[PDB]
């Protein structure tokens, strides 16, 4: 095969093998075989040896197996340079920007105005086929695989220049950014302060499977190798965005034409209105001269172009003192921290109570009490302490310390892992979760108990904990909330049938500290009865499979809890089987 042909196949092989490694270990819907997949991975290595030049440590071959094809974060120089934009914060400067451009033709020049997203990335394509995709700077990290987890990014193009380098951004939508931040808070990890960083991390994952469960989307706006001077007949910035879309590239961020600094400013304000109506955090707009041909004459500065500019929304950050900190208790039992700030003004709305997330965040940022703090809006939606103003410390700041007891039940607290929490099985703060967990198919299957009925039974006062479900024997109780006997009797038998699930499913229902779906069964077989387990010694618990010293000494305490004993007894009496099924 000719030198060129080998290159082409080598790109295609590296692709299909990356595609199917995704189609397999990530999506789980493979098309080709598990053995017919190795027929390509071996040929990749064959051409990679009779043409050693094309050896790229990005190739699948450098770390193979039946393991997830991880992305090599090796530094890579982009064909063309990826510049950054200069920042304007007033119409005076935007006007001055157009004035700077007046060193040639007339007065009001036409532009294309689009919104500002988060997370810069470049994607190099050869003969339409995709080679790599990197991060940013001057040299960027290779992360092709993690970019495959975003279904919108196209692999094969058509009618494109031999060497195409399309740019754009990979971002995480607010909803997702918020979902991720919640999972992190509960686990006791440090949360992200914005979508840029969260998109960064979610893309800087060894296991591309992780990147997939994160929101991650991508939008594309600019070209490089391939723009006009190469093969594309693109003349307008507006045509480019449509061109990009047509070729299968996802252009989701907003854009529209505008005449002169005056008209640019018209789009700006119309944008500033919708500053928090977009599915993503946009901190400004980007006005670019629409005539591509005029981009050549107009160069770049040391670190920025001349034909384009970034008009930014006002920075909504304010300084204030953290007066006191109060504690709340989540649905899962986790004692959450809340800082009571000196009333300040961010975007008109008055901020006075801000979240401190968890003990880690408080520790990282070194958040104390008498402290002055800079508070901002993460994702431009959730107020939080961006960082403390250290130097202004009077020395009398008090360090944030958790309470001995749970503020919502009085039970002594316990630090399970990285976050403080309430062990009390009957804590009122944990009722809804307790009931649901117990009703799920994995636990004691009780289908009728929808997420709504549980809170209705809780609100009305008919249920305080798990055992009370069995005392609802009276359908007279169930015949008032959207149910009318036809729906009542059907659930009455479910609460009844659930009595019969064994110790295995029963231990998993009462959610003990750490006792998983498997840890419950291995625990139930080894004890036979709830009574026996309640008399377990520390040793007997450790001797069990998967039970660590840390989880043994935990189960041991919950077992002796006068409240756990109570809940168990009241469930026994209702006739719930305490044995192994
Ligand atoms: P902002 O001051 O937050 O800077 C964001 C950087 O990312 C690039 N960028 C974001 N969004 C776009 C669009 N829509 N078009 C072109 N470039 C964008 C810029 O290079 C900013 O420097
Ligand atoms: Zn409690």
UniProtKB/Swiss-Prot annotation:
Biological process according to GO: DNA repair; DNA replication
Active-site residues from the entry: 116 (n6-amp-lysine intermediate)
Residues annotated to bind NAD(+): 34-38, 84-85, 114-117, 169, 221, 288, 312
Natural source organism: Thermus filiformis
Protein name from the UniProt record: DNA ligase
Keywords tagged on the record: DNA damage, DNA repair, DNA replication, Ligase, Magnesium, Metal-binding, NAD, Zinc
Residues binding Zn(2+): 406, 409, 422, 427
Record family assignment: Belongs to the NAD-dependent DNA ligase family. LigA subfamily.
């Amino acid at each position: 095969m000719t030198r060129e042909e080998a290159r082409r196949r080598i790109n295609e092989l590296r692709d299909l093998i990356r595609y199917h490694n995704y189609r397999y270990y990530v999506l789980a819907d493979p098309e080709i075989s598990d053995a017919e997949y190795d027929r390509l991975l071996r040929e990749l290595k064959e051409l990679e040896e009779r043409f050693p030049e094309f050896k790229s440590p990005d190739s699948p071959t450098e770390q193979v197996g039946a393991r997830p094809l991880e992305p090599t974060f090796r530094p890579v120089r982009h064909p063309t340079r990826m510049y950054s934009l200069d920042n304007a914060f007033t119409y005076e400067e935007v006007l001055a920007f157009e004035e700077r451009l007046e060193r040639e033709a007339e007065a009001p020049s036409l532009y294309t105005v689009e919104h500002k997203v988060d997370g810069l990335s470049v994607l190099y394509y050869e003969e339409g086929v995709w080679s790599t995709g990197s991060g940013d700077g001057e040299v960027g990290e290779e992360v092709t695989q993690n970019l495959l987890t975003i279904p919108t990014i196209p692999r094969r193009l058509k009618g494109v220049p031999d060497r195409l380098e399309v740019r754009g951004e990979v971002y995480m939508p607010i909803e997702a950014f918020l979902r991720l931040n919640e999972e992190l808070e509960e686990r006791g990890e440090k949360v992200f302060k914005n979508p840029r960083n969260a998109a960064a991390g979610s893309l800087r994952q060894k296991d591309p499977r992780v990147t997939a469960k994160r929101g991650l989307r991508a939008t594309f706006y600019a070209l490089g190798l391939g723009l006009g001077l190469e093969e594309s007949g693109l003349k307008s910035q507006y045509e480019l965005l449509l061109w990009l879309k047509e070729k299968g590239f996802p252009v989701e961020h907003c854009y529209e034409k505008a005449l002169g600094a005056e008209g640019v400013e018209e789009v700006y304000r119309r944008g500033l209105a919708q500053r928090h109506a977009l599915p993503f955090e946009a901190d400004g707009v980007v006005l670019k001269l629409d005539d591509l041909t005029l981009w050549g004459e107009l160069g770049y500065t040391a670190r920025a172009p001349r034909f384009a500019l970034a008009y930014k929304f006002p920075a909504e950050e304010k300084e204030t003192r953290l007066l006191d900190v109060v504690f709340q208790v989540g649905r899962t039992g986790r004692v959450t921290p809340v800082g009571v700030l000196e009333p300040v003004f961010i975007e008109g709305s008055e901020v006075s109570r801000v979240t401190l997330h968890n003990e880690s965040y408080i520790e990282e940022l070194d958040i104390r009490i008498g402290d002055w703090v800079l508070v901002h809006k993460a994702g431009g939606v959730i107020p939080e302490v961006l960082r403390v103003l250290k130097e202004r410390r009077t020395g009398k700041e008090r360090p944030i310390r958790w309470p001995e007891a749970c503020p919502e039940c009085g039970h002594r607290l316990v630090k399970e892992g990285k976050v403080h929490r309430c062990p009390n099985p009957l804590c009122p703060a944990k009722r809804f979760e307790a009931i649901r967990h117990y009703a799920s198919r994995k636990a004691m299957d009780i289908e009728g108990l929808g997420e709504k009925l549980i809170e209705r039974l809780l609100e009305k006062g008919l249920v305080r904990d798990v055992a009370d479900l069995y005392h609802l024997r009276k359908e007279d109780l169930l015949g008032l909330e959207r149910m009318g006997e036809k729906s009542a009797q059907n659930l009455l038998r479910q609460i009844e049938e659930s009595k019969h699930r064994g110790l295995e499913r029963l231990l998993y229902a009462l959610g003990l500290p750490g006792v998983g779906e498997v840890l419950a069964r291995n625990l139930a077989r080894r004890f036979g009865t709830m009574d026996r387990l309640l008399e377990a010694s520390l040793e007997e618990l450790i001797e069990v499979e998967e039970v660590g010293e840390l989880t043994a000494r935990a189960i041991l305490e919950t077992l002796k809890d006068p409240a756990f004993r109570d809940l168990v007894r009241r469930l026994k009496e209702a006739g719930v089987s305490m044995e192994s099924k």
